[PDB]
Every structure is written in C-alpha cells, then in structure tokens.
Structure 1
C-alpha cells in the first residue's frame, strides 16, 4: 500500500471504487465534469495493481461574514475499499492532501460529511445547519403584513442565464455561498430532465430577484420538493412562496433551507412550516488560523477587545477585534481561550455560539465576559446558508 497522485490509467479503478462506495454516484461522465474543478496534484490514490483508496479536493470560492470570498479546498470523492478498512488509509490520504492544501496557500478546507463521527479528528467542524421545512399548504394563509404577479412558471433549460445571474448575486451576499462554475450549471440543468423510472420533470418559478426549482416526489404524488430557492430580496422570497403555496394539486411542499428561513413568519400559523429534519451541512477545517481570523468581518456592535486564543497543536495568538476587523498575531503569553481546530471551524461562519460550545467544554475560558464578547463578535449579520453539496 503506497500513496501517490493518480495517472490517467488510475481513473477507471477510481470510478469502480466510487460506484461501489457512493449509492448516489453521479456516474463517469458527470464525474469527468467535476474533475475540471480538481487542480493538478488535487488527488491521491492508494494502490495495493488496483485502487483501494482515493481522495481529492476541488478549487472553490466560499463567502464568509463581511461578504469576503476565500479560496477554499473542497474535499470530495473520499473512499476506502471495503477490503481495506482499519489500515489507516483515510488518515494517510487526509494527511497528504492537508499538506498539499496548506503548501498551496488555502486558508480553509471544506467538505460534506457522509457520517458525523469521522472528520472531527482531522480538524473539521460542522459550520452550517440544514433545516428541512414541510408546509401543509392546504392550510397556509399569508399574514396581512407579508409582502405582495411578478413570478413566472418556466422550463429551467430556457432561463439558465437568469438563474446564473441571481445565484451569482446570492452567493456574494451570503456566508456559506459558493461560486457555481459552468460545469455545475451543465450538471444542474441535466438533473432537471425527467428520467424513465427515476425523478419527475423539474419546473422553475422565476422572479427578477429570485428563483425556485421544484419537482413532484417520485412516489408521494402530493409532495412537491423544492431542490433550490435563491432569493436576493425579501419581496422575491415572499413572491416565490406565494407561487409555491399555489400548487393546489399538492398537500405538502418541502425544502432544505437554514434555521433563520423567514417562511414560518410569512404565514398566519407559523406551525404549518414544520421542521421535519436537521443536519450539519458544510464542515470547515481552518488551515491557517491567522489568515482565516483576519479575513472575515466581525460584528461592529461589540466594542474593541483583546484576548489570547490557543488552538490545540495549531498555534497561540493575540487576537484583537474592533471596528468589525480582527488582528491575529503570534504570542507566548498565557492563553485565555483554548479549543481544538474543529471547534474554530464550527464558530467561523456564525452557525454555532461560542457559549454553547463552552457549555460542552469544547472551548475553555475562565472569563464569562470574554465568552459573551466572542459570541457577539463571531455572530453573522446575514444568516449562514448552505450553497450546494460537493
């Protein structure tokens, strides 16, 4: 078992391991489209010869609080052969890619986790929260206060330009936003086709400042699933939900959204927007603590404050936050805040409160005033959302 960058010869073995490893496997043609996002030396394989281990990263652009865009290494296509469990192959592959990612100059790495108990040990913390809402739309009435026909029902394939422009405005404004390159729009509008024996046809609801893609469920013919809703203004968001509640042949509309989705508040009965499912979305590994902490914006409400942050096996820093900006410098002074690297990734986009992690002792300080100040400073004005799975 040796670890190396794959050759063109390795890719059929990698597709075999992928097919056996991922039930939702996009297939070889779709995988070749995603490969365009993998930089030279972005992939590792383990051979025993046949491929028993693989991992790669993609070049991504992640929006963080303050509308700042970071170069981000997106880990994906991570698989160990069922024949080679418990031989340290994942630890070896993650160590090699992290070395390359760090040397390449990426301040953060990100991934979507297949299981929740794996990536904490490699320094990844869950940084966004997926929240499924199911609306029983037969009972749904809009509140007198709710904004609002500016919405059109359209064929997705015919309005790509308009989707692309709205999404581009969306992703620059929202923490968790990702640049979506051309190949991923090619892949998205191909999944919008009805498949024989698979997913039904997708429709779009199109506003000047928002869109929703939805399809009826394969089996439950009274359920509409919203695959994607991107709204740049509150008017667009409300207009799109007026149109979705107007699907009079459905009993239920479901969407995977974020905890601060205002939909419940648009209705006279907030309870009709039931939370049916919750899960970690994007996981972050802070590769470079100083570059990451200095890059994001902080809340202007909290007054200037200074502390000493230690990350376990990741450095100790004098951290000064004021006027929405942070300066993070090396120091050997006594730490006032200690935490593992994963905990920092969980705080970084504003999804988890420092005081909540402190209550579980994932984050240690003897100053409760400092906890309150961290909480307020790392909060995001714009609620953090999840762009797309990779």
Structure 2
C-alpha cells in the first residue's frame, strides 16, 4: 500500500501541492526552490500511496544542511528538518514516525552531531527526541512614554533602504551568528529571499526600512492591520552600543505608538528605559528545537562555564547510551561506561539543556531529569549555562 522513498523530480509537483495545503505561508514554490539548494542529495523522503507510475504523494519530509553556533562560539554541522507534512487523508497511519525514523538514520549516518527544527505545534516532537532549545520573547514597547535612562549608551544610525545595503547586512549578520548561540549561517540564497520581501506588496505587507549602524541593523515595517504599530522583523546587534543606538532610533519613530519585536528573554532593552514596564512581554514561545544525534560528539563540542570547578558524573540518556561525563576548564570529556548512572534523562531533555535556555534544576523539578544529588544538579546547572544568552536566527 504505502511506500517510503527518496523523491524523484517527478514527485515535485505532488510535494508542492501537499506543501501548499499544509503550510499557509507556503506560496511561493519559487521560494521553495531556493531552500531546495540547502537540501543535500538524499536529504528528502516522500511517502507514495500505492505503487505504479507517479502514484500520489501523501507524506514528505526533508532536512537542510545548516551551521549552528553553540556556547563557546563553536559551530556545528546541523541537520535542519522542514517541510514535514502528512496528507489530511492519511493522518494516523504512522507516516510521520516512518519518515522521521528514516531521516534520522540518514542524518546519523551522514555524521551530523545534531538535528534541529521549528515546531508547528508543541506536542509533536518530544516523542522524536527534540527538545525546545531557544525561547522567543515578544516585546511591545509603548514608545510614547519611553525615555532612555541616564546610564544608557549614547548620530551613528542611518535610515536606509534595505535593498541598497546588502553587503553591510551580510557582514553584520555573519559577525552576529558566529558569536551568539543559536546563530545560523545565512547562505546567499536566503539573503536573496529575505531581500526580496522588502518591497511593498499590494494587499500584503507595506515596504520595509532599515536602521543601519556600523555594528548592527534593524529591519522594520508598519503593521498592515494596525498603522500605529511598527514591527521589527529583525535586529542584529554585535555590540551593546549598536543595540542601544538602534533602539534610540526605533523609539524615535514618532509616527508610531508601539514598536514590537520577537527577541530573546535576556534582551537588555527593558533596562535601557527609565520605566522597565514599557517594554512589555506580549508573547512567549519555544523557538528552535534540538535533537542530539550523537551525545558524546555534541557534549564534547560545546564550551562550558569556567566558573564551576572540575567534576565527574555518569549520564544516562534513555535509549541513547551511558557516559562518564567529565567537565572542567570549560571543556568536557564524554566516554562510554557501564558504571551506575548518577543522572538520567530522555534525549529531548538534553537538547533543551544544550544551548543553556533551560536550567537542569528546572527540568529536575519536573522530574524529567532524575539525579542523585542536589550538588550535581547545581553543577550541571552552572556548567551548562551560557556566557552569551542564546538567541534565535531565522525560522526554517
């Protein structure tokens, strides 16, 4: 009946159709064919219904080749899952399990230490070993009241047409993504896509503008629905100076009542202002999800906090191996063992800890993470934290 296989070029139109019916944002396929360049040979799986010549697609999934920055400014090859979809006609038939299992084998065999995704819903991917690893934080600032604090840094920012400063944006983003956990390399093809969206579309979005600083930029747009709201679609700042100068400019949009931005929980913006409330948290949600494919490769690859003293323990990941884990001097050694476990957790929990967005002690309080001693917990909690707060790059 159902067969699982790598798509042919003859499978494309079926895939585009399924995609269009599954993702509202989809159209255009032309953009789909930009992301396609990020898909390695054999990075795609489809499920066909039946057998014969061109039987219809009813399931699809793929991964893209990505570079993710993890704490200690270390960059990992990362397999980014996307365009995962099952036909509304074939829902509870195990297609998602089969497609994910097949994709994970390929990802493992190809040597990725880590896989990642953005979840359309929050209850799907834990079962596959993905844990929420970054946190999206919407701030809406009522700029009518906003005054900067005497201490705040600061002219240096220019109001600019996005399409005329691509080189400057690329260089800034590139510096940004290398320094911040969560950072993703943004390939030329994605800069084409992003740059194009800047022009106003009738019936769609208004034209975008940019605020450019030698060390950061912001891209923003008036909201279509509300005309006193400015939406900051992206703000990449490499220094604190740039971050503040950009916000002085945004708060300068006197035509507006409110500025909103999707940011991270440690965004220092509230502290730039004399009234920290004006920077109001309007929304929160999981951002990037991680599946640790290879536990020791991943644990050894990232840097750890230097503050915690050297310690050793035994970590067991449910159906993922048991390891002697030694952390000291910001570095980890992670070797096979059969000594008794001191800590245990499912694979997804590990991905949630990995970039420091969640504290081990919080996971432990929910019993996801079982441990021997509170001391070990406090150490796992200090070691795994990140000097530079974790942020989210572009969705995929």
Where 1:317 maps in the other structure, the secondary structure is: strand
Q: 1:1-42, CA deviations, whole angstroms, 9 ceiling, x for partnerless residues?
A: 000000011011000000000011141100001000000000
* 2-structure distance, mates of 1:297, 1:240: 30
* 1-structure distance, mates of 2:20, 2:219: 27
Question: Among 378, 381, 385, which residue is 1:375 paired with?
Answer: 381
Alpha-carbon spacing, 1:176–1:6, altered in 2? closer, same or farther (3 Å): same
Q: 1:117-159, CA deviations, whole angstroms, 9 ceiling, x for partnerless residues?
A: 0000000000000000000000000000000010000000000
Matched, 1:158 2:158: no
- CA shift, 1:75, in A, is 0.1
Q: 1:84-103, CA deviations, whole angstroms, 9 ceiling, x for partnerless residues?
A: 00000000000000000000
Where 1:30 maps in the other structure, the secondary structure is: helix
- CA shift, 1:182, in A, is 0.4
What's the TM-score once normalised by structure 2's chain length?
Answer: 0.98
* 2-structure distance, mates of 1:58, 1:278: 26
- CA shift, 1:196, in A, is 1.0
* 1-structure distance, mates of 2:242, 2:374: 41
* 1-structure distance, mates of 2:202, 2:248: 31
* 2-structure distance, mates of 1:196, 1:143: 40
Where 1:265 maps in the other structure, the secondary structure is: helix
Q: 1:308-329, CA deviations, whole angstroms, 9 ceiling, x for partnerless residues?
A: 0000000000000000000000
Q: 1:213-238, CA deviations, whole angstroms, 9 ceiling, x for partnerless residues?
A: 00000010000000000000000000
What is residue 20 of structure 1 aligned with on the other side?
Answer: 21
* 2-structure distance, mates of 1:326, 1:26: 45
Where 2:115 maps in the other structure, the secondary structure is: strand
Residue segments in structure 1 that go unaligned for 5+ positions in a row: none
Question: Among 202, 207, 211, which residue is 2:208 paired with?
Answer: 202
What is residue 265 of structure 1 aligned with on the other side?
Answer: 271
Where 1:36 maps in the other structure, the secondary structure is: helix
* 2-structure distance, mates of 1:178, 1:91: 27
Q: 1:252-294, CA deviations, whole angstroms, 9 ceiling, x for partnerless residues?
A: 0000000000000000000000000000000000000000000
Question: Among 174, 182, 189, which residue is 2:195 paired with?
Answer: 189
What is residue 249 of structure 1 aligned with on the other side?
Answer: 255
* 2-structure distance, mates of 1:184, 1:60: 12
Where 2:323 maps in the other structure, the secondary structure is: strand
* 1-structure distance, mates of 2:165, 2:93: 49
* 2-structure distance, mates of 1:283, 1:292: 15
Where 2:190 maps in the other structure, the secondary structure is: helix
* 2-structure distance, mates of 1:306, 1:342: 22
Structural RMSD (CA): 0.4
Where 1:205 maps in the other structure, the secondary structure is: strand
Q: 1:168-201, CA deviations, whole angstroms, 9 ceiling, x for partnerless residues?
A: 0000000000000000000001111101100000
What is residue 125 of structure 2 aligned with on the other side?
Answer: 119
What is residue 149 of structure 2 aligned with on the other side?
Answer: 143
* 1-structure distance, mates of 2:65, 2:265: 28
What's the TM-score once normalised by structure 1's chain length?
Answer: 1.00
Question: Among 67, 75, 83, which residue is 1:69 paired with?
Answer: 75
Which runs of 4 or more aligned residues in structure 1 lie more than 3 Å from their structure 2 counterparts after TM superposition?
Answer: none
State how many pairs are aligned. Answer: 390
* 2-structure distance, mates of 1:144, 1:367: 45
Residue segments in structure 2 that go unaligned for 5+ positions in a row: 50-54
* 2-structure distance, mates of 1:56, 1:361: 33
Question: Among 292, 299, 308, which residue is 1:302 paired with?
Answer: 308
Alpha-carbon spacing, 1:115–1:128, altered in 2? closer, same or farther (3 Å): same
- CA shift, 1:366, in A, is 2.2
Q: 1:68-87, CA deviations, whole angstroms, 9 ceiling, x for partnerless residues?
A: 00000000000000000000
Counterparts of 1:331-342 in structure 2, within 5 Å, are 331-342=337-348
Question: Among 84, 87, 91, which residue is 1:85 paired with?
Answer: 91
* 1-structure distance, mates of 2:371, 2:219: 46
- CA shift, 1:202, in A, is 0.1
* 2-structure distance, mates of 1:195, 1:9: 32
Where 2:34 maps in the other structure, the secondary structure is: helix
- CA shift, 1:383, in A, is 0.2
